[PDB]
DNA sequence: GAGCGTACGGCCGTACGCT
DNA sequence: GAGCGTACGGCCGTACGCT
């Protein structure tokens, strides 16, 4: 499913994780195929803070990502083997896009933490005037979201390890009450 | 640019969670509807798919909603519309379907291009007075349409048809109830704001499932009505019959709510196969349209059918729990509500709907009376009116001259310029006076309602009593004591 | 009751076959549309989704078309609309899409709730004069709506955008053509009904693919235009060898994978590596690194033979004529189209004349009413009912039932000074308009010239350059 | 997928072959479950006049029918083993319904010919006022299509074996031209 | 022979909360 | 604990003609 870039120099290579073949086709058309790779994902991935390892390792989307990044998993992980120095989480500015963002960040936090620590994980969404990536023409997708000349990527930073561990357990973990209380306390 | 992983996680999880809560999974306390259901019913209203007109294909309604209100998969709309038409799912069905709308054995509805739908007579009551400024309209997803934020809901639908929804941080599970009991409860509450749950339970005995069956005791019911949470035990209606030759058989005629009959029978079959239950020789589904639900369990000679039946209640979905968790949107926020809170919010909603309808009708009537006053002046001095218009070069001059000469308003003068020559006839002249006099009396009647809060409150009671007498039916679920 | 297996088989197979033929798989010769495509375009017209208004979501269009005209899967409607918006599929795109509408590598369009659409400027021409009694309207599937049987189609769409369809007992495969060449062909036919195919080919050189590329010779073209059937060889534009244009309906990704397959299995040789250097900026670019001292001319000729780098277009010109499938040659296609245009213009003129004559009659009565308004008012005021008022107005002023009705329906605002002058000015202008319309209907040559003039305007406005090179040999 | 009847006496037993789970559910609800069985089929089946035996035998919908009828196929066919004496082809009065009717009759003619010869194969469609079986409520489906007391079934009869062999080869065979000529010749009707 | 495009059938998977 | 119902992702099969 991965539409790889021609370059094999990871420092200059970037991968855009897009939600569906609905954003896959347009980004594959709009990209600079020299240094930009596209990994279209089949909707919501497994919540790795709830799921057990055997279920996680047998998931074809989880497998696709591990294979594409070339770092490996925990015991065999290697940051020097990373095939891209930019892993861009591309989602829509909506309910489902927001959830996909949280599930993906959960996977990277629990299974590929040094990737965040190295500043390789980025976040991108449509610019104001659009709600979804599927609304955009490939040229606008390039000029506003993919063109390194003028784009809007947010680098994901790990500032406090204790606070992050607590946040991921509260929001994505098995205890509903902690999440319910967070919603109740921060509702606007 | 950079972003803290913690800040992003909290922000994105909150955006997702709130959206599922307020705009997807949970119903509003006032009308008992989730966004998708409200849209289907509004869609049916605007497309004039009323009970008195012919059925139209499901694809016309689905496509319209897809469409103008719900930019999600057409299957989500169709599936929700199908359930609303199922008499085993909805205590008071909201959709009048023609064709295959699915079965109790979990068989799906036919493709939307084959099935046909329209509103039920009771759905007219959900939408009644929607275009009389009773409820607040909001822009649709693209700003091209206007959609209701809530429906007038002239019957307490939340409790009547129940609800279930899995959200984020919470879930809802409201059982359906009997409409007669509910309206009686609202009427008792309308007379005494300080009414107790125990007093309300004299009207609202407990849940009332479309699938009938039994409820074991009032302890679970009471707990659920007092707190908003409680387990209610649902039992199938089963009798022990004689086969002949000293042999016995268990006959099941009613099963618990949301229980798949085919899957229940397959569970009984699995247990006899795995030898987990003994004394059963045969098991057959003798269900028909004419005879209703009939599941026959043949019992082995000399074996106690009472013991076998008690084991079936324990080991199979023949006895199922209804875990009550009454969560609904109150002032656009999720809230765990007890029986009294549910009825209070509903009654408050009804008072507002009728007050706003009366206020709208009064504005509408006062505006029309003002127009007729101008037309009456025009008809009394028509030779003068015509001269004024004929002498004028433009419509602006004609209007200014009519306002100045006959002390008319801009609105009155406009109505005279828009008056057809046909209206100068004898019958048309009398029609205007007759309309005016009738309107004067209507305005007085409306003003009487708005001057006294008790007269308005009684109008709510009278309108609810009419619904109760029209759509109120018999209790189906027996509450055994217990 | 009983039924013979033979009788049943023949009856059921015929019902199925004729329905796929007339109401699904094949296009009408006049507008070049299959039922689903006609419905999408009519739907866009009724929903006012014109080029001058803002985009609307595809779901809003699909849902309308599904419920009002096409009671089949919403994906069938969406898929057909997506293709209409693809500049690599349609020579003259009919849908103006915003968002992901698919790619040349067979990537699908985004969900219909994400994409937006509206009509293209050229689609206005397919629908032009539809509400001027130019075409016949028929009841929709449930009798609640009215839908066109054919569109006015003020440009020869069948040949312009081409067609393909698998039916029962037959199939169609018409390639797309250049609009300038086509209108020039129609104009040449309009001046000489006895024109030969060879003469027509002086205007219409051959097919013109949106994907450009080349055509090997005119033999295949000629055979297809003469008989309605013929193989046309499409060749990629290639000059290390660099491919800049690929044949029509060829998947670039699959073509590259086919070349990659040939190199791995040692089927072809003298090639180091192959890369898809296509970009939105550079356009189609497929580069193949040729091995040192190996003949690139020989390698390229083998690629044409062994891969879709050279693909055939099997022409099979089948279209619905008088609601029946027919194998048509180039002249027949243009004759049916020109005949359709003549009918559209004749019917528009006849409609405009009825409409004008009716209005002139109304203005005559209003002129009498305004000249004697004091008497008119007295007559109405004296009358108990509208029936009495009407009978009394017809009797005193010699007015018709229609004229008397228009006076009773007249608003008091129509009594102002400027409003009486407006009625006289409209009447005098209308008298001249009627004369102009009658001149068009009295002379078949004046009508035929009007068709020519209207077609020339389309040609000058939408006509573009040829993309496909027709290589000599 | 088959929803069998309680009775095991084939003489009184009937099977209704319905298009999709779209007609399956309503007929399963509307039937007399004592003597009426329902076999919901997943749309258009294989054209057995065009397809080869290996492809036919591996088809699940073909397999389900063979299993349900009991009989067996071709040389191993046994009319005495037939579980139902009425096999009703239930289709809609539309383009797709008509094709399903032709594909099913083709299967029955080439693989289960004595079943037609015994007068076991019947044809049913919605009554006038209805185009599709999915438009009908189970009670109407029963009262007009499934109730032996007042229904409209057409018994499929094999009159001329040579004419039928020719009809099935012309309409369902590999030679497009014979089919094209038949369409061209009979298009008026 | 395997795609094309109109039509129609099926089968899985993910989150979310509470049994 | 597979299922409930709102949301979203995927995959596969059938006919039909031509090449």
Numbering used by the authors:
A (entry chain B): 417 to 545, 580 to 638
B (entry chain A): 10 to 491
C (entry chain C): 10 to 248, 258 to 491
D (entry chain D): 417 to 545, 580 to 639
Article excerpt on this structure:
The bacterial type II topoisomerases, topoisomerase IV and DNA gyrase, are made up of two subunits forming hetero-tetrameric complexes, which establish a transient double-stranded DNA break and facilitate the passage of another DNA segment through the break. Type II topoisomerases are essential for transcription and genome segregation in bacterial cells and are the target of a successful family of antibiotics: the fluoroquinolones (FQs). Imidazopyrazinones (IPYs) are a new class of compounds that target bacterial topoisomerases as a basis for their antibacterial activity.
To gain insight into the conformational transitions involved in the formation of a ternary cleavage complex, we solved the structure of a binary complex involving the same S. aureus gyrase core construct and DNA. Even though the overall conformation of this binary complex is quite similar to the IPY-poisoned ternary complex, this binary complex presents some clear differences from the IPY complexes and all other S. aureus complexes with DNA. In the binary complex, which is crystallized from the same crystallization conditions as many other S. aureus complexes, no metal ion is observed at the TOPRIM domain catalytic site. Comparison of an IPY-poisoned ternary complex with the binary complex shows a sliding motion of the two GyrA subunits past one another when transitioning from the binary to the ternary complex. The SaD83 residue (equivalent to EcD82) is situated at the ‘sliding interface’ between the two GyrA subunits. Modeling a SaD83N mutation in the binary complex suggests that the unfavorable interaction between the two aspartic acid side-chains (SaD83) observed in the binary complex can be replaced by two hydrogen bonds (not shown).
